[PDB]
Design a protein around this ligand. Structure first.
Ligand SMILES: Nc1nc2c(ncn2[C@@H]2O[C@H](COP(=O)(O)OP(=O)(O)NP(=O)(O)O)[C@@H](O)[C@H]2O)c(=O)[nH]1
Lengths: 44, 267, 214, 246
RNA sequence: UAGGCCCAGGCGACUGUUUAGCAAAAACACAGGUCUCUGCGAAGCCGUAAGGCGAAGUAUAGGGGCUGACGCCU
RNA sequence: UCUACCCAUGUCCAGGGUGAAGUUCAGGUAACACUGAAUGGAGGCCCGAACCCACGCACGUUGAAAAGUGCGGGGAUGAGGU
């Protein structure tokens, strides 16, 4: 049976990428929160 | 011989007895081709102190003269009788007035007692494979009951409210637990009303052939593309063809119930 | 006096919605109008024929029904809308669809401006006068009860033991049962229809009370 | 006219098809073509607004000419072709000037006929004239509403209108649906009744043919567990003479 | 490695679609029939609005209901 | 990125059957519609592999597997699968 995760590099960058986050306001808020916590990796 | 008597037949008697009080009038369906043998003394013993009318359904398949004579015999016997065709309403219009005339005594007594007239409660009873449900469907114009071309279709009694005028009770067919006269059993098996997988079809075919030879020799002569009246049965059986040695018995009984022959009656 | 019979007639200045009646104590008259119903025993509800059935009309008819008084639904001003065949049934059927809670009330049509069929109002009134005050025999009433429950043996199981009448107006009836909790509003309404069909009981509400095994 | 298939299968019982007896070519003209993609009843937000739509064979738009306005320059009908977008057939015209166009095909057009549109054009099938010039009693189609636009009314398959009166600065016309209304007298219209008149007798005959045409199944609202809607102060009500009470 | 066959009754005209993971059916859809609204910035819908679908289509054409092949009764 | 529906572009379906329209000769005729003969290759047509489903039975149920396996079964040029 097909499991729910079928990896693909293009869609991952198009949806959870840095520029997609920076395009809208809520993505910028997400980036700000992740910077505040101090996570080593942010966006995707 | 013929013994068919399942448990739902036994339960039907008890249910009818337990719901006897509500009944106002009874319709007793009787086949026209065999008016005397189709009566059920077992259910008649339970049924007393109740007015009733004899109905002759499937009247298109029987000879008119013998049916009318039997109608006279029932009439002067001391009971009302009528001839009806269920599939196409022939005498269905003249039963509501008869019921009204019969029950008028209690109706006027109740009216003078100080209540509004109410609906007539009727119970339909008879042997299986007779128009016990087709008649109800025609009367109600609704096609509410289940009908089939084999005995034993319905299994439980049911109330049907035809307008504000009639309350009909239906009932599965009932047969007496043990037969006594083999000729009556043979006639019943010929007309249907039996599962046909419990009986011997060869004897039924023999009875049919001998009755035909005795009564309608011309109809036996025309038959189906053959003209002979020998002493045995194997002459007619092998008309149109290893061929079925005696399975053609079914053929003999197949057409007759569908009136491939002309109208006839056994009385 | 009408047909060698005396009568009393009262007007009530109309009734409007409770929410928008925030007047300067001029709505104090509505209390007077409500009082007349208590002293009256036949209620005539009037609807306009030019206008359709308004929601407030159903509410007003509720007060009369809850007071246990005979009701005769009346419509006026047919001179406005068309008088034709099957225009009789357009509002005759529509009223039944909307005014379900009262079905015993007879329906009368008359226009006061042109004085059409005005004299037919009283024939309705006198008939309704009797039914609001009527008693049925105790023997007969009981005999009808178990006929209804026999054809509908779906009341553990609720048991019916007795039935009789208490009041003349409106006709109250009490049935002795093993427990009145088993009584269902669907079944209670069922008993009323059979009683309303056994006899006339036209143009008057009916109330049924239930008593325990005692 | 109408062809009936023989019942060689359960799905062909009663299916009927057209005859295509008025088609002279099978290839369109590259010049008068344009792309046309399919929408599924969605809109600029992507949400569904119209149900029972979507799917079907691909199509290409043909640029019809509902405005005419090419006065003088007599044209000759070159071919009559089938169009998938509408319910009628179209006709290609090689104008003597040189430019080719597409028009709706009125009933009775033969190849080689000479057509002409303008105030001086005569009364015959295929011509286009202002409503002022055409006389009473004629049957016209491709009615215009306001001068300068193109053929708003009565241009489906086998539909026609009629001219009744010539009241000043207007014209009384009766439409296909028994409507009677006035139209500005400076508008244009084309003579004749639209062809392919037997289009309404075609039996689809199968569940998949409607799928080909682009219609999706419809579910009854019961298992989904006479009020006039025309505006009551709408403009152009002063122009409606006789209502569509049918 | 390759079709078991023959009779009699219901139900649904047929091919298809459904409760991923208990119910594949007589349930849904379907071709046909019928009622109702709509004269074009149409009627209906999505959006606070701008802006769109219907459609670049015009009553033999589009929305919304009810039934459900085709032969003999309504 | 699983599943529901839609949009734009690609791609897949071993073999074998039945024989519609149309066309030609032609009893028939004055010629038909109807005989037959030849040609023709239509179908939400038939049997059946790849592919897609999931009707019956058995096993497994701290399983090889948090929906599988084995033997039978349905569709298989289309309202198809991907
Ligand atoms: N020719 C003819 N056939 C009739 C007549 N009445 C009933 N039938 C046939 O009888 C069959 C239905 O009989 P039915 O009334 O259901 O018999 P039943 O007594 O109800 N059997 P059960 O009680 O077990 O349901 C059908 O085949 C119907 O055609 C009639 O008057 N004439």
């Amino acid at each position: 049976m097909k499991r729910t995760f079928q990896p693909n590099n293009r869609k991952r960058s198009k949806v959870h990428g840095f520029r997609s986050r920076m395009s809208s306001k809520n993505g910028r808020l997400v980036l700000a929160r992740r910077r505040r916590k101090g996570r080593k990796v942010l966006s995707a | 011989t013929i013994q068919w008597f399942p448990g739902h037949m036994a339960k039907a008697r008890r249910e009818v007895t337990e719901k006897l009080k509500l009944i106002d009038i009874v319709y007793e369906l009787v086949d026209a081709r065999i008016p005397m043998s189709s009566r059920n003394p077992m259910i008649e013993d339970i049924l007393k102190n109740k007015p009733r009318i004899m109905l002759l359904n499937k009247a298109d398949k029987a000879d008119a003269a013998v049916t009318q004579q039997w109608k006279e015999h029932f009439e002067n016997q001391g009971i009302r009788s009528l001839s009806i065709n269920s599939v196409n309403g022939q005498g269905l219009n003249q039963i509501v007035p008869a019921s009204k005339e019969i029950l008028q005594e209690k109706f006027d007594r109740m009216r003078a007692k100080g209540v509004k007239p109410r609906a007539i409660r009727a119970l339909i009873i008879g042997i299986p494979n007779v128009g016990k449900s087709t008649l109800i469907n025609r009367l109600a114009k609704k096609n509410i009951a289940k009908t089939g071309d084999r005995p034993g279709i319905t299994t439980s009694q049911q109330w049907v409210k035809v307008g504000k005028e009639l309350e009909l009770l239906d009932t599965p067919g009932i047969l007496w637990p043990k037969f006594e006269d083999e000729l009556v059993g043979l006639r019943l098996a010929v007309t249907g009303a039996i599962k046909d997988s419990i009986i011997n079809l060869q004897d039924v075919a023999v009875f049919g052939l001998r009755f035909l030879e005795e009564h309608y020799p011309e109809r036996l002569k025309e038959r189906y593309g053959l003209d002979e009246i020998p002493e045995d049965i194997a002459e007619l059986f092998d008309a149109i063809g290893l061929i079925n040695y005696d399975k053609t018995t079914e053929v003999i009984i197949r057409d007759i119930r569908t009136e491939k022959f002309g109208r006839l009656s056994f009385e | 006096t009408y047909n060698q019979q005396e009568f009393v007639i009262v007007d009530t200045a109309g009734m409007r919605k409770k929410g928008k009646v925030y007047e300067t104590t001029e709505k104090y008259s509505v209390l007077r109008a409500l009082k007349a119903i208590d002293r009256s025993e036949v209620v005539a509800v009037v609807l306009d024929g030019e206008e359709g059935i308004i929601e407030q009309d159903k509410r007003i008819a509720g007060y009369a029904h809850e007071a246990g008084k005979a009701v005769v639904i009346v419509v006026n001003k047919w001179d406005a809308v068309d008088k034709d065949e099957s225009t009789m049934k357009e509002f005759e059927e529509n009223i039944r669809d909307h005014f379900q809670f009262l079905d015993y009330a007879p329906i009368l049509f008359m226009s006061a401006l042109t004085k059409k069929r005005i004299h037919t109002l009283m024939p309705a009134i006198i008939k309704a006068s009797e039914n609001h005050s009527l008693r049925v025999q105790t023997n007969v009433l009981n005999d009808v009860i178990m006929d209804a429950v026999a054809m509908n043996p779906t009341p553990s199981r609720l048991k019916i033991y007795y039935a009789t009448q208490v009041s003349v107006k409106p006709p109250s009836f009490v049935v002795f049962v093993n427990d009145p909790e088993l009584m269902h509003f669907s079944y209670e309404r069922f008993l009323e229809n059979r009683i309303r069909d056994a006899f006339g009981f036209e143009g008057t509400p009916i109330k049924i009370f239930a008593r325990a095994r005692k | 006219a109408i062809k009936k298939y023989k019942p060689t299968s359960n799905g062909r019982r009663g299916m009927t098809t057209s005859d295509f007896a008025e088609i002279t070519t099978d290839k369109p003209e590259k010049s008068l073509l344009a792309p046309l993609h399919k929408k599924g009843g969605r809109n600029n937000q992507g949400k569904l607004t119209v149900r029972h739509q979507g799917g079907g064979h691909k199509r290409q738009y043909r640029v019809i000419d509902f405005k005419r306005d090419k006065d003088g320059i007599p044209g000759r009908v070159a071919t009559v072709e089938y169009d998938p977008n509408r319910s009628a057939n179209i006709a290609l015209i090689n104008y003597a000037d040189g430019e080719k166009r597409y028009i709706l095909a009125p009933k009775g057009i033969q190849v080689g006929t000479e057509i002409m549109s303008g105030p001086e054009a005569d009364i015959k099938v295929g011509n286009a004239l202002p409503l002022i010039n055409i006389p009473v009693g004629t049957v016209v189609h491709n009615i215009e509403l306001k001068p300068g636009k193109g053929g708003q009314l009565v241009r489906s398959a086998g539909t026609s209108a009629q001219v009744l009166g010539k009241e000043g600065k207007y014209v009384l016309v009766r439409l296909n649906s028994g409507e009677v209304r006035m139209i500005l007298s400076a508008c244009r219209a084309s003579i004749g009744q639209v062809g392919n008149e037997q289009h309404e007798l075609i039996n689809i005959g199968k569940a998949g043919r409607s799928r080909w045409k682009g219609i999706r199944p419809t579910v009854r609202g019961s298992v989904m567990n006479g009020f006039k809607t025309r505006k009551k102060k709408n403009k152009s009500d002063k122009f409606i003479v006789r209502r569509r009470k049918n």
